Amino acid sequence: DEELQTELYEIKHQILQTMGVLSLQGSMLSVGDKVFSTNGQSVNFDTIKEMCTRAGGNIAVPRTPEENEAIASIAKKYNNYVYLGMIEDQTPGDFHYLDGASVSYTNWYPGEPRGQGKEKCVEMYTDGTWNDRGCLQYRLAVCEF
Amino acid sequence: DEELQTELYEIKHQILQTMGVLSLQGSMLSVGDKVFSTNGQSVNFDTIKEMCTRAGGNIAVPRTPEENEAIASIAKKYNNYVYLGMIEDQTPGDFHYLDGASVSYTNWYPGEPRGQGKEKCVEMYTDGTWNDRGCLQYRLAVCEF
Amino acid sequence: DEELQTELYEIKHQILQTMGVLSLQGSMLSVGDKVFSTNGQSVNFDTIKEMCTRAGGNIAVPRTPEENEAIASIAKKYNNYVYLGMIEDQTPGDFHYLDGASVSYTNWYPGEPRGQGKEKCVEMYTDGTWNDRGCLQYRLAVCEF
Numbered sequence: 001d002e003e004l005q006t007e008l009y010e011i012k013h014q015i016l017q018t019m020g021v022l023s024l025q026g027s028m029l030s031v032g033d034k035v036f037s038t039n040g041q042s043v044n045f046d047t048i049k050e051m052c053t054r055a056g057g058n059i060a061v062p063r064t065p066e067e068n069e070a071i072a073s074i075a076k077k078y079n080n081y082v083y084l085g086m087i088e089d090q091t092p093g094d095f096h097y098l099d100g101a102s103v104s105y106t107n108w109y110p111g112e113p114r115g116q117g118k119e120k121c122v123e124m125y126t127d128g129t130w131n132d133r134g135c136l137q138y139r140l141a142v143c144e145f
Numbered sequence: 146d147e148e149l150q151t152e153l154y155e156i157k158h159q160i161l162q163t164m165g166v167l168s169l170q171g172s173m174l175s176v177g178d179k180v181f182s183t184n185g186q187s188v189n190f191d192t193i194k195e196m197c198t199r200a201g202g203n204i205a206v207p208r209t210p211e212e213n214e215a216i217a218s219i220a221k222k223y224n225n226y227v228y229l230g231m232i233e234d235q236t237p238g239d240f241h242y243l244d245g246a247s248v249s250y251t252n253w254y255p256g257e258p259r260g261q262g263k264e265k266c267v268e269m270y271t272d273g274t275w276n277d278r279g280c281l282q283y284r285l286a287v288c289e290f
Numbered sequence: 291d292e293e294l295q296t297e298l299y300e301i302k303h304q305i306l307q308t309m310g311v312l313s314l315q316g317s318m319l320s321v322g323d324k325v326f327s328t329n330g331q332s333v334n335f336d337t338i339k340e341m342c343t344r345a346g347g348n349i350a351v352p353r354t355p356e357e358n359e360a361i362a363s364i365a366k367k368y369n370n371y372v373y374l375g376m377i378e379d380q381t382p383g384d385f386h387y388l389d390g391a392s393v394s395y396t397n398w399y400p401g402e403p404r405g406q407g408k409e410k411c412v413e414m415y416t417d418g419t420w421n422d423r424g425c426l427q428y429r430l431a432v433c434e435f
């Protein structure tokens with residue numbers, strides 16, 4: 001269709017414009033096909049999950065070095081640790097994404113994880129490395145869409 | 146078309162991402178197919194209408210309990226009354242949306258409306274109930290898109 | 291396609307909603323098919339170019355009176371001059387857009403340009419008129435998408 005082609009072009013341009021504005025003003029960070037954003041609040045794991053789902057997204061989880069660096073830049077920006085989208089398996093030391101799949105990419109701080117099963121959550125330090133920790137602390141809420 | 150399907154999927158995802166960011170940061174509230182947002186300014190009815198149309202929208206008007214609660218949450222958030230998108234008919238006590246249609250859903254504070262035709266505008270209290278009032282007061286500008 | 295028509299309508303509405311929110315909150319200004327926005331930072335020409343490209347856009351450049359007035363309103367809003375997307379040719383007095391094409395629309399302050407080739411950049415005063423100037427000053431970063 002000849003009109004369909006032009007309509008799609010305009011639609012794609014408008015999306016580029018809206019995403020460009022959000023990017024320019026630091027409202028979000030786009031990495032590949034993933035968009036990260038924070039509301040600036042520091043709350044516990046359960047609360048963060050609720051906030052993200054309310055917005056139509058999920059708690060952020062890095063699956064590549066580039067995504068990890070992006071979340072880390074936000075942690076650094078707000079000078080606060082970030083809870084990530086993963087929880088410990090029944091077997092201590094093993095973690096899984098919230099959908100149940102086993103974690104692949106990892107960036108544990110040397111020595112971590114070592115909570116012996118008592119720290120089922122994972123927090124990201126400002127340098128981007130990870131630490132298994134309890135889930136009741138107040139951490140920066142970072143979501144992915 | 147095989148490429149049209151993938152293009153639309155990506156377009157829809159990007160929209161979800163941009164709307165998710167705006168939602169997460171409290172820049173807007175989505176209720177069904179309607180989006181509410183405020184610039185935080187408190188001005189009169191005529192001014193609000195101009196501001197909304199300038200942005201490509203219209204003065205907010207709740208047509209369902211869910212929409213009413215959404216606008217109320219914004220009123221509460223900014224601790225200020227909100228002018229709604231309706232004005233009094235020639236017959237006192239009867240109101241109409243700006244397009245001329247008679248108002249259906251209402252949420253008048255007990256006793257309202259009772260301006261006897263001297264208060265053609267409608268303001269929303271922070272608890273979400275309505276009050277007919279003059280149109281020259283300074284009220285939170287809430288628009289719908 | 292009967293479903294394609296409805297899908298496009300919804301997509302276009304969502305775009306209108308997201309753009310309406312950004313417009314209402316002063317996050318951007320739309321003029322025709324062009325969107326202008328600033329991150330509020332004041333840096334040199336090279337830095338501005340980087341910031342804009344990072345966001346998926348380019349340094350703003352007015353090509354019509356309407357676009358010029360839009361950028362001027364932003365300069366006025368932030369009370370700071372704005373570097374524009376153009377640089378001087380090898381021949382003093384002649385300027386070109388960054389893609390190499392010769393500038394068409396101009397709005398030089400009376401007497402400008404007169405840097406004799408020593409001021410290859412162009413800054414916009416808050417009244418919207420232009421002045422050729424060095425490229426190392428700190429100016430409001432305004433991008434176009």
Ligand SMILES: [Ca+2]
Binds near residue numbers: 119
């Ligand atoms: Ca640990």
Ligand SMILES: [Ca+2]
Binds near residue numbers: 257259
């Ligand atoms: Ca009354």
Ligand SMILES: [Ca+2]
Binds near residue numbers: 402403404405421422
């Ligand atoms: Ca000069």
